[model samples]
Target: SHMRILFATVSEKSHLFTMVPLAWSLAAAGHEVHVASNPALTASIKSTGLTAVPVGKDHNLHEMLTENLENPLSDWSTPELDRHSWEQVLMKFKVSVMFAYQTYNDCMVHELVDYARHWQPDLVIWDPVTYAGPVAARVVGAAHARLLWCIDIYAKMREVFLARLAEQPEERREDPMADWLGGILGRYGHTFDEEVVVGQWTIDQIPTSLQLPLSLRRVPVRYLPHNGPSEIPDWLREAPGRPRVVLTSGVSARAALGGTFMPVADMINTLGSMDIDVVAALPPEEVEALEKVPANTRIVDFVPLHALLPGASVLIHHGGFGSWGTALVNGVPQFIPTIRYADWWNKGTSLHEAGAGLVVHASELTAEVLRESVERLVEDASYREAAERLREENQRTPTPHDVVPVIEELTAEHGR
Candidate 1:
């Protein structure tokens, strides 16, 4: 029997990108899939050949910061900026949650309750952020499953906060992290018990290596799930001999609203000056904006890195999870120039620690530094060895196809 699955997702392009392949996979397995997201992404979601129900309006967090805030970038590294970002993120979260709640109450819970009362569904699947998934599943008396697209901050890092709390002075036992998290949970109608927090999901589909509490010595860890592009270009397939270097800054960052990564372009230009062959996957307009194109450089709209990376000497990117996974799966050394997002911090730090990659600050990026990083990555045998170790580790874990069965089993077990 075909399962009817509803995915409630955040409004970020990266989040949608991570979930689309899973949706496609479900559809391929003869399931009906529907997605609920902000109206801004409705068209993009529809382009994927799935039914997209608009639930929320644009929250405009970026615009609000640029307009109302004073010198928003002033204290970039302090807890003050971190607190500010979280405050803004909370506003966005509230807007999304309200809309999602209404969507669930009206469409999935009440409206579909009647429909399913007569023609029932087998299961419900949702992104973890949408706590409504579990609610709706309970209302309909169906099975539920969570599809995590990023690091499960609450699941993996709860112990870290608790450990930090234990080490504080007797007089300073305020536990700001715990208190703040409790407040956030209260907003979501959840209590902040450690067991309840961790036990909320039946199955966590994240890679074990990517899980936090870094001292546990887990393997095959990664931030989130990402699908390789459906197609690989013919030229990349035919290319022979020379070492290929894949350069990208992910889809959203290349778009106008998501902020730009000029450092990636700068690095590409620097790499163009070298003896290596560079294949840059970027937007057509951005590629056109480049003033000079090197003879050894090939700029295309997209190339499946999974298909291209085996031949690559190195992968130079903006450290998004998709690109990071592609490089890791193919056993390629990485040179990451990062900007915003936890992927920037997490992957760069992990790769640096593992000796599998080099992290260059976007502010300090230059042609000389880019050249040196690439040359060192190519010449260093240890980097290649480390990459192979990660690749072997990745092989041991479940691929997306392998993971779907787990989702199916959990959905079956939890529905009653």
Candidate 2:
């Protein structure tokens, strides 16, 4: 039962945070855990207390995407993933392989395949974006699962992509995911299958009602929040007497930075006028952009969201997995303004359906709209009740400790 487990992801800090909980879980369960990533992430990986295997050279992925804005990628994010037309899905997948997914996985796949062949891991758990992970899993005949940090949309979209692919004539039915991954699999003398695009199974932290109706064996694990690096400030422990409201943002907000969609200064001014104690989880330089802060406002460059969530009455964030899951566990109502690409639409819609939260589209979001949503989140006892129900659901799932035996069983059943 003490099998070797290999974890892989591209060089994104947040993606790495998603793996940290499970990686430590497996290690604590007495399995050998090695996290393989590009060289850029080796030091960070080591900080998680798991072994790091630097398989490829680092990439400037963030800089490249930012540099090539409006690059063929705007389609693969959210509302685009909902497009049911086969040709549209195919075209998006084509663009994704060329500009997005493949870029994230290209350097890693060959190197990962190299390591899997030699190390022969029993199971490979990979970030869903890191397609190289499953390819290496196939190469070594390892039982692999695609780990999700966002919504279940990727697997859902792939089903749509395949359904549309079947409608195409033999000569025209080309799959970008298959075509690109096929060539990589060919190098290892393994042929490509639909499994490469999806996975043998999926390990999802998103709850059941929220998950897509995929046929794959979904193993649910309690989402253990892992926001990257922070210290608990003295003030956070001493609770503010008034109802506390946390205002936070993710990578996109930082990237957008007053680019009109997310006007940081404007938001602070709006939230500051409220009677509540407002804590803005923001970077220092961004905090500097505004003048004359409110006496009731607090600005922190970074704090582990898990540490901060419990004391807050309501949360306003980017609707990222970390933010959503953290709030889910803490029984806090959330108001999120998210772009389609972040799959906030999916997460936001699910919670809204359950009366736990509300969602606003990025274009529709403003200080006034956010103000109303946050007010509803705080004032509505129904929202508090619903959030607690979700928190109960979160606790109902197996912890990493509980899942270890199940993973061992699955590996024995699926792995070579």
Candidate 3:
């Protein structure tokens, strides 16, 4: 039977990229699909050949987070699960709801609800933080699932919070995340459910070793790299004479969040002077910001990860799932300076645990240390062997094309 599928996300580009392959797979399988978000993401959604439905006003989340230079809310996304006390857990959820999550979803929920009712989608797949997706799904009685871009930190944190909440005295217990979301549901004559907070099920792309222990129903899909519309550059067409090492902080973070994990110019210079070819896939501003570009280094504003990773020996990045997943699939050894924001630390830790990469704390990393890490990643055959093992593990999972029927069956069972 033909079905209409709706995809929803916050105005984040990298999150959308992870969903593209699965969405495209469903489309190819003869389903009608539409990707929804703020007007800000319309161009990005459309670029992936998916239909874009612009909902309410664009969120100024980046601007809002930027104003607070201290970045107090950063820990909310990547909580120290099981380690945080009840008060710590409560406050993180409280302030995050007040400051971050609400700002991203409030603008879209009402409008999304209306659109979902009108379209009557059978299934709604959403970015992890896009509460509006499940809200709209509930309003329209559609089966919904979260398509995760990183480790299941959101669900894990909530799991931890709930367990800790159980330990508190009845009078002292409060659930700010729930209260805020339930209030939104109340407006539509609906009550908040745990499904709205997480999803009916989750589509996890990261492999099992990297995933946290959770009881949620999950549909595992192997991450196939889709780094936007990419073509092989003339220089990338040939293999490098020396070991090829790529330095990138990833496109989405650099463009949206701004700044690099380390001193880009100094790192590039240090690596470029080595016997290897250094390819720095930086944004235009970062490229121009460089005081010097070494003869052995190739600095490009953007290049497809697909085209570059196959021939590369090592990848140095600020631990983003986008870069991590790409490097994993390509079987390239990685050197990551942990970025505490998002899943950087977790991803880097998992990579290190798998023996496929090296991780350095962002605060401790220096150009000299980075050079040392890169050298070890190149010389150590163990890293490459482990990377290949990780790649094999990735290949064993179902591809998006293969997962379509599973989605179809699950939606049939779960969808109203």
- Better TM-score candidate (2, 3): 3
In order, the Cα lDDT scores of the candidates are: 0.59, 0.81, 0.85
- Of 1 and 2, the candidate ahead on lDDT is 2
Per-residue lDDT over 1-416 for candidate 3, one digit per residue giving the tens place of the 0 to 100 score: 79999999998887888899999999999999999999998998999999999999987777776554225446644566556888888887887787778899998888999999899999999999899999899888899999988888788888888889999889998999778878888888888888887898999899887798787999899999988778776776677898999988686666443343466777888897799988888987667878878998988877898779897999988777778889999999998876566677788888898889998877677877987888888998999999999999899999999999999999999998
Tens-place lDDT per residue, model 1, 1-416, is: 56887765556566566667677777788888787666777877887777886763555544543343112222121222224433333333344334332332323333333343444556655655444444445445666655654444433333444454466678755433335435544554545443222332434333455544433212222233343344755565576566677787675555432332344456667878888888888787677677788888988776666677776889887666677777887889999876534335566666877899998766567788788888899998999999888777777765556566666775676565
Q: Provide the clash count, candidate 3.
A: 0
lDDT of 3 at 165: 91
- TM-scores of the candidates in the order shown: 0.71, 0.94, 0.96
Q: So what's the TM-score on candidate 3?
A: 0.96
What does candidate 2's lDDT look like per residue over 107-197, in tens digits? Answer: 7778888998889999999998889999999988999988887777787778777788788889888888877999889978999988877
Model 2 clash tally, residue pairs: 0
Select the stronger candidate by lDDT from 1 and 3. 3
Global CA lDDT computed for model 1: 0.59
Q: Rank the candidates by TM-score, best first.
A: 3, 2, 1
